[PDB]
């Protein structure tokens, strides 16, 4: 259920295990209360999964590159 398709484990299995270890070591009587204290590991696991923030950074660099070529077309 966490077994890899061509490798031993999945590519983001260890990030998931970090998150579950954080959830294991908290002592709050509710899962919803424990989740508020492990949000950094859940965020890193989601970044392993889909890379939304790396894609966002590349989109911002592309917006600046498209801005420095339309507004700026300076000839020598």
């Amino acid at each position: 259920a966490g077994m890899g398709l061509s490798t031993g484990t999945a590519r983001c299995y260890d990030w998931y295990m970090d998150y579950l270890k954080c959830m294991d070591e908290r002592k709050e009587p509710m899962i919803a209360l424990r989740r508020e204290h492990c949000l950094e590991w859940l965020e890193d696991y989601n970044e392993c999964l889909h890379r939304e923030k790396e894609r966002t950074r590349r989109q911002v660099i592309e917006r600046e590159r498209r801005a420095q070529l339309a507004g700026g077309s300076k000839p020598a």
Binding site: A1, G2, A10, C12, Y16, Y45, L49
Partner: protein, 387 residues
């Protein structure tokens, strides 16, 4: 080491031996199979773990097997029981899907197989409609499981996609407005499968819900739909099969009110009383006891149905679910009218009960007379018992 899995190996070995024994018995031309049924009941007891819900399902299925006579029907009921048992232990959507689909296929095939007389084509028609409606709900379950699996990367049942899985579960309980497959099934399929369909899968699915399910949503509109639609439909439908189908929709609305306000103890108490009443309802030969089912399904005070409704009402009032409670009380006032119609039909009438001619003389008087003693269970129900 596989030493912790001897019950699974025992399940498989027992199925392998039972098929061969059933083959050998049929090569002799035996027109009855009570020995096969006893071996099936032994196999049911031998594969069930030592929990309360597991043994409740086991004893229920042992009692149900006395109304089935062919070898193939017994095999289909055993393989439906495997899905019903292992759904209570399912902690993913993989096993959830497989157990639900095994149960659906077994029910469809049994609806096709057991019909007789002029009602054969009606039963096959209603089985086809049920299969087509079940296929798209199974597709919805698979599609949103694939969505959840892609989003989370794991097999955890969290997030927005659990709303559609919840709708899948509500379909399997016949919750209005997705209720009409059960209404179609009640009108044509014979009484033994109707008895099977109203008891065992509801227990299995509610135990899965109690054991391994959380959602961040509500089911209140389906509570309102089930209670109002079931009560008004049973008030308006003159055929008795449709009366009992709509009254079942009303009862599943009450069970959903028990689920929605938490407090699963009232859910389990009402479900147990309902299952015993169902076991009485579909095995009746004397029609005077049809009035006892009526007074105990209307919630009238000294009988056990009152207690099953009244802890649901008590826990709903405890957590202040006022609007759903008011709707439940209005529909309870409406339900009394058609249960009184039942009492008018079958109690204030001359008594006629035909004798048996080809043996088997009134063959389920033991179970029906035992289940009528739901007038003596209320002494244990008033105590803190089901928690």
């Amino acid at each position: 080491a596989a030493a912790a899995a001897m019950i699974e190996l025992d399940l498989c070995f027992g199925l392998l031996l039972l098929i061969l024994f059933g083959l050998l018995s049929l090569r002799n031309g035996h027109v009855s199979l009570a020995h096969i049924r006893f071996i099936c009941q032994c196999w049911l007891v031998m594969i069930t773990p030592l929990e309360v819900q597991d043994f409740a399902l086991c004893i229920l299925t042992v009692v149900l097997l006395q109304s089935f006579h062919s070898f193939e029907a017994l095999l289909f009921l055993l393989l439906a029981y495997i899905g019903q048992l292992y759904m209570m232990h399912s902690c993913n959507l993989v096993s959830f899907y497989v157990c639900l689909e095994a149960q659906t296929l077994c029910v469809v095939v049994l609806c096709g197989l057991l019909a007789r007389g002029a009602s054969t084509s009606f039963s096959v028609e209603a089985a086809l409609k049920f299969l087509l409606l079940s296929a798209m709900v199974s597709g919805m379950a698979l599609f949103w499981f694939s969505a959840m699996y892609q989003r989370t990367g794991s097999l955890d049942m969290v997030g927005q996609e659990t709303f559609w899985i919840l709708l899948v579960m509500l379909f399997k309980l016949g919750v209005a407005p997705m209720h009409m497959w059960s209404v179609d099934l009640y009108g044509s399929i014979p009484k033994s499968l109707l008895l099977y369909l109203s008891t065992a899968p509801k227990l299995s699915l509610f135990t899965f819900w109690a054991s391994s399910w959380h959602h961040d949503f509500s089911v209140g509109v389906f509570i309102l739909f089930s209670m109002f639609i079931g009560s008004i439909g049973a008030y308006g439908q003159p055929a008795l099969r449709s009366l009992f189908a709509y009254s079942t929709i009303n009862e599943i609305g009450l069970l959903l009110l028990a689920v929605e306000t938490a407090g699963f103890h009232t859910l389990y108490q009402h479900l147990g009383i309902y299952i015993i009443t169902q076991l009485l309802l579909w095995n009746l030969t004397d029609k005077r006891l049809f009035a006892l089912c009526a007074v105990s399904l209307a919630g009238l005070p000294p009988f056990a149905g009152f207690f099953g409704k009244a802890w649901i009402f008590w826990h709903a009032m405890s957590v202040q679910a006022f609007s759903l409670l008011a709707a439940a009380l209005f529909c309870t006032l409406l339900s009394l009218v058609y249960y009184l119609r039942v009492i008018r039909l079958f109690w204030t009438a001359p008594v006629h009960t035909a004798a048996s001619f080809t043996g088997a003389p009134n063959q389920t008087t033991l179970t029906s007379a035992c289940a009528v003693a739901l007038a003596f269970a209320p002494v244990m129900l008033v105590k803190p018992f089901v928690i």
